[PDB]
Amino acid sequence: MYWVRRKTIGGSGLPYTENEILEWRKEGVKRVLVLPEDWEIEESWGDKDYYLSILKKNGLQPLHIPIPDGGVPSDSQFLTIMKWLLSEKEGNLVHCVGGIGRTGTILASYLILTEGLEVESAIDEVRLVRPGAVQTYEQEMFLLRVEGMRKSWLKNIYSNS
Numbered sequence: 001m002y003w004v005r006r007k008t009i010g011g012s013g014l015p016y017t018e019n020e021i022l023e024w025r026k027e028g029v030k031r032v033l034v035l036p037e038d039w040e041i042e043e044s045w046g047d048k049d050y051y052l053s054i055l056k057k058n059g060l061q062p063l064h065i066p067i068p069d070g071g072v073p074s075d076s077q078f079l080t081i082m083k084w085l086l087s088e089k090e091g092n093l094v095h096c097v098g099g100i101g102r103t104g105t106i107l108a109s110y111l112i113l114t115e116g117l118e119v120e121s122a123i124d125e126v127r128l129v130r131p132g133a134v135q136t137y138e139q140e141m142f143l144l145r146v147e148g149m150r151k152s153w154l155k156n157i158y159s160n161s
Contacts, residue, residue, distance in 0.1 A: 001023070001024055001027055001093065001099075001137060002099070002129045002130050003129065004110075004111070004125065004130075005090065005106050007090065007126065008059070008083070008089050008090060008091075008092060008100050008109060009092040009093075009094070009107065010029070010080075010092070010093055010094070010106065010107075010129075011094045011095060011103040011107050011126075011130060011133075012024070012093060012094075012095045012103070013095060013096065013099040013100075013103075014036060014040065014041065014043075014044055014095060014096070014097050014098075015044070015095075015098055015100040016044055018026075018054060018058065021054065021055065022058060022099045023058070024060070025058060025059060025060065028090075028091050029091050029092075029093040030059075030060065030061070030082075030088070030090060030091030031060065031061045031062075031063075031088060031091055031092050031093070032055055032062045032063070032070070032093045032094075033063050033065065033081060033084060033085065033092070033094045033095070033106070034051075034052070034055075034062055034063065034064040034065070034093065034095060035066070035067045035094065035095060035096040035101075035102045035106065036063060036066065036067075036069075036095075036096050036097055037066045037067075037068060037069075037126055037145065038066065038070070039129060040096075040097055045136070048064070053091045056129055062068065062078075063081075063084050065077050065080060065081050065084075067096070067099070067102050069101070069102070070101065070102075070135065070136045070138065070139075071102070071107075071136075071138060071139075072102075072105060072110045072138055072139055072142040073102035073106070074151075078109070078146075078153075079153075079156060079157065080119070081106060081107055081152065082109075082110070082113065082157050083157055085110055086114075086117070090133075092106055094104050094106050095109075097135060099130060100130060100132045100133055100135060101132075101133075101134065101136065101139065102135075102139075103130075104123075104127070104130055104133025104134045104139075105127050105133075105134050105135075105139040105142060105143065107126045107130075107151070108122040108123050108125070108126045108133065108134055108143055109122075109142075109143060109146045111125055111126070112121075112143065112146050112150060113146065113150060113153060113154065116150065117145045118147060119140075119144045119146075119147045119149075122143065122147075123140075123143065145152050
């Protein structure tokens with residue numbers, strides 16, 4: 001597990017045991033955004049719902065937003081992901097299978113929206129703590145789009161009464 005922004009947001013891969021989940025807790029993780037698909041989670045936990053219950057049993061609030069390997073969240077999923085990540089700033093962990101591609105893309109997107117970083121800076125930022133972050137062209141294209149649509153995303157994320 002690695003932090004992109006000390007104790008506010010970090011990434012990791014899929015845990016193999018409950019002890020590894022307790023390691024996240026000791027590190028300061030409090031909320032977990034789960035990105036792998038059901039079948040990927042099941043390789044280590046047998047059942048996706050069981051895994052989510054294990055996260056809750058260990059004091060972590062999870063949100064499952066399945067993204068296919070090598071892909072990116074749909075616009076609807078991205079809205080959900082960002083509303084979730086922005087709801088609480090402390091202890092956010094984002095994870096996929098190994099913590100590189102999908103996770104790196106989401107983390108970079110988070111920096112683009114929250115700090116107004118240009119796509120290249122956001123990518124370098126995540127790669128400094130996680131070599132290989134942002135794996136596919138689709139993910140790279142998605143990030144430039146996030147930068148261009150930054151104002152629109154913020155407006156839609158915070159649309160209130």
